[PDB]
Amino acid sequence: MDFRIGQGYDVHQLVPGRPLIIGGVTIPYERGLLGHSDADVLLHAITDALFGAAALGDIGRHFFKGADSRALLRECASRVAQAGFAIRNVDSTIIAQAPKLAPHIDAMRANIAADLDLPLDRVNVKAKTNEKLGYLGRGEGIEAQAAALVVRE
Amino acid sequence: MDFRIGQGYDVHQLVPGRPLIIGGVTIPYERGLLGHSDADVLLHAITDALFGAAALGDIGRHFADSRALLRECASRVAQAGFAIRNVDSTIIAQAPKLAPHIDAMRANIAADLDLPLDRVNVKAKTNEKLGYLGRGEGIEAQAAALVVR
Amino acid sequence: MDFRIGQGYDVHQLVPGRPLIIGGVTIPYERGLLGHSDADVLLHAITDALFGAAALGDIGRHFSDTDPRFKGADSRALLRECASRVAQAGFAIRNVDSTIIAQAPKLAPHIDAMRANIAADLDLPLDRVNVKAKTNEKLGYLGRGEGIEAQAAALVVR
Numbered sequence: 053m054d055f056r057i058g059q060g061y062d063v064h065q066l067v068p069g070r071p072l073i074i075g076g077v078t079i080p081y082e083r084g085l086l087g088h089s090d091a092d093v094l095l096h097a098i099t100d101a102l103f104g105a106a107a108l109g110d111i112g113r114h115f116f117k118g119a120d121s122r123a124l125l126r127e128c129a130s131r132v133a134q135a136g137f138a139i140r141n142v143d144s145t146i147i148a149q150a151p152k153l154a155p156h157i158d159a160m161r162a163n164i165a166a167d168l169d170l171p172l173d174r175v176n177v178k179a180k181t182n183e184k185l186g187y188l189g190r191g192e193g194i195e196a197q198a199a200a201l202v203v204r205e
Numbered sequence: 206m207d208f209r210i211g212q213g214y215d216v217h218q219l220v221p222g223r224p225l226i227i228g229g230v231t232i233p234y235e236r237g238l239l240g241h242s243d244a245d246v247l248l249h250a251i252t253d254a255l256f257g258a259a260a261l262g263d264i265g266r267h268f269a270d271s272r273a274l275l276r277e278c279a280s281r282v283a284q285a286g287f288a289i290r291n292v293d294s295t296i297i298a299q300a301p302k303l304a305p306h307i308d309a310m311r312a313n314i315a316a317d318l319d320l321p322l323d324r325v326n327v328k329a330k331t332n333e334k335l336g337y338l339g340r341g342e343g344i345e346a347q348a349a350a351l352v353v354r
Numbered sequence: 355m356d357f358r359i360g361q362g363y364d365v366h367q368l369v370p371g372r373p374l375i376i377g378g379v380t381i382p383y384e385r386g387l388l389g390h391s392d393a394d395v396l397l398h399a400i401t402d403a404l405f406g407a408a409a410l411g412d413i414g415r416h417f418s419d420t421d422p423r424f425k426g427a428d429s430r431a432l433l434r435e436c437a438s439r440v441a442q443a444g445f446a447i448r449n450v451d452s453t454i455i456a457q458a459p460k461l462a463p464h465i466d467a468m469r470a471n472i473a474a475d476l477d478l479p480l481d482r483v484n485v486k487a488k489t490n491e492k493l494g495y496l497g498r499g500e501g502i503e504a505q506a507a508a509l510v511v512r
């Protein structure tokens with residue numbers, strides 16, 4: 053009954069000449085997210101929520117030589133398990149004015165579920181626009197938010 | 206002990222010409238939220254948090270005013286096997302003052318979710334004059350929900 | 355078995371001539387957060403998450419920004435009083451997680467000290483308190499260093 057909650061936030065700029073990768077899914081689009089990594093904003097938010105729930109700090113405290121964000125999410129899951137926690141569920145929201153993310157959501161859930169060794173019914177991803185407000189509304193970046201529940205076994 | 210958490214986000218533009226409805230409450234103001242129906246930013250965030258906790262997707266996958274949608278959301282969460290344990294939320298608006306209307310929103314939300322009043326919370330924040338929120342160009346809501354098998 | 359979750363959000367402007375105090379830590383910096391109190395954005399977010407989890411409203415309900423008794427108020431004192439009211443309502447705190455978002459200064463060197471302050475104020479062990487530090491990847495007013503934001507989540511049990 054030693055439950056813990058975590059929350060994660062990430063945002064990346066949208067830039068020309070890079071693939072758009074969110075939740076491990078490559079999405080056709082003229083721009084992609086900027087970062088040292090593949091800049092997977094969704095996977096980063098989830099990673100931080102998981103580190104947060106296990107009180108293990110954040111991505112900056114932990115991170116891998118040219119690794120993509122799925123390898124990092126897998127490693128995050130590893131460190132969470134190492135600290136004696138089991139993951140109960142993940143929920144998240146992606147905020148992007150464009151492109152449409154709906155057709156890709158189930159693939160993202162499947163990717164996250166595989167990376168965390170969770171059944172699909174314990175992983176959720178939601179898609180939002182920013183109603184044309186601010187930098188998200190102008191399509192200058194994409195934000196992700198995440199929440200994670202774990203239990204110390 | 207099969208608990209799940211969910212989280213929700215919503216924002217709408219604040220424009221002259223529409224009524225301001227937040228948490229089912231019509232609030233007198235020179236401007237209102239722009240959306241498909243009543244643009245109830247608070248109920249939308251809560252609805253998303255509930256679907257998220259149940260891993261049922263989001264508002265767009267499932268879906269009338271926003272209270273009707275919240276009630277249908279709650280029905281679907283119940284059918285998926287989940288009981289709602291609590292909801293917490295924050296509205297971010299530079300104006301008007303929301304404090305007077307909080308109990309009314311909590312009452313509407315608790316009714317729609319068939320929850321005791323003490324399992325529903327709504328908080329109110331300004332954006333300290335920063336950004337589109339701080340300039341009164343929109344209103345944001347954030348929600349968290351805990352459910353159980 | 356009566357668990358509840360809460361979430362909190364806060365933002366304050368960054369201005370010259372104010373102490374920069376985040377998570378109870380005075381951080382050397384040429385600007386600080388503007389507010390009625392010491393403007394501790396992180397502690398406020400956590401305070402709101404705790405009040406939210408207990409369904410006790412928000413920091414404005416409990417510690418009004420128009421009340422002169424809270425002018426320059428120590429947000430750690432506010433957080434302890436919040437924790438006291440949450441306990442009085444019948445709740446025990448299980449954990450806190452949080453994020454600070456700031457273009458500058460570097461927060462990594464101060465995070466452990468913030469964690470320790472929050473754990474002290476909530477009478478929790480360090481391993482139930484987490485503070486994460488983020489930039490906004492150069493976007494928006496946060497990217498321009500006009501303010502600093504904090505987010506928090508709390509789990510309690512009645």
Ligand SMILES: NC(=O)c1cn[nH]c1NCc1cccnc1
Binds near residue numbers: 100110
């Ligand atoms: N403290 C940290 O460095 C930190 C905390 N969370 N993520 C971090 N760094 C990696 C990063 C940076 C920017 C965007 N996405 C991921």
Ligand SMILES: NC(=O)c1cn[nH]c1NCc1cccnc1
Binds near residue numbers: 178263265
């Ligand atoms: N995927 C979705 O459509 C979606 C996810 N959450 N809400 C959605 N659409 C309804 C909506 C849209 C804009 C503002 N408020 C509510």
Ligand SMILES: NC(=O)c1cn[nH]c1NCc1cccnc1
Binds near residue numbers: 330364366412417
């Ligand atoms: N309802 C409220 O006033 C309220 C809800 N949360 N914080 C509030 N006011 C105090 C405050 C104000 C500005 C920055 N930080 C804290």
Ligand SMILES: [Zn+2]
Binds near residue numbers: 087093
């Ligand atoms: Zn990132």
Ligand SMILES: [Zn+2]
Binds near residue numbers: 215216249
């Ligand atoms: Zn909406």
Ligand SMILES: [Zn+2]
Binds near residue numbers: 364366394
């Ligand atoms: Zn504050």
